[PDB]
Amino acid sequence: FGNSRADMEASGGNSFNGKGGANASNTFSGTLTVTVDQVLANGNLHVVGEKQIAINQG
Amino acid sequence: NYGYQPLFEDRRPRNIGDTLTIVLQENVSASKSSSANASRDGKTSFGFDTVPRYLQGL
């Protein structure tokens, strides 16, 4: 053990941090009058409708 | 002669040229938003401050 033959010192480190995420949203509010353009075999009604508003510059 | 006119029925437009009051009340509002993120951090280290003799060559 003389002459620092067995003296030793070591250190080590390892680090990892990952993360992730996502999100989506949508809202819609209004009222629209549509018209029936087809009646299906079970009585369900296909409906289509369009509202066009022009206010000033569009 | 203006033809037959119902007595107790509410006054409705029935023929071409009849007038009707439209109360314009429109309130439409739609919105959508989304986001995504991802992160990754990595750190690694190793150090031999004092190396014993039998480990020196390595």
Author numbering:
A (entry chain B): 117 to 174
B (entry chain A): 59 to 116
Paper text:
The bacterial flagellar motor is a huge bidirectional rotary nanomachine that drives rotation of the flagellum for bacterial motility. The cytoplasmic C ring of the flagellar motor functions as the switch complex for the rotational direction switching from counterclockwise to clockwise. The basal body is made up of the LP ring, MS ring, C ring, rod and export apparatus. Here, we present two high-resolution cryo-electron microscopy structures of the C ring-containing flagellar basal body–hook complex from Salmonella Typhimurium, which are in the default counterclockwise state and in a constitutively active CheY mutant-induced clockwise state, respectively.
To obtain the C ring-containing basal body–hook complex in the CW state, we constructed the constitutively active double mutant D13K/Y106W of CheY (hereafter referred to as CheY**), which can mimic CheY-P to tightly bind to the C ring and lock the rotational direction of the motor in the CW state. The density maps of the LP ring, MS ring, rod, hook, and export apparatus in the CW state were locally reconstructed to the higher resolutions ranging from 2.8 Å to 3.8 Å. Although the structures of the LP ring, MS ring, rod, hook, and export apparatus in the CW state are highly similar to those of these components in the CCW state, the protomers of the C ring in the CW state notably undergo inclination and compaction, suggesting that the binding of CheY** induces significant conformational changes of the C ring for rotational switching. The LP ring acts as a bushing to stabilize the rotation of the rod, which serves as the drive shaft.
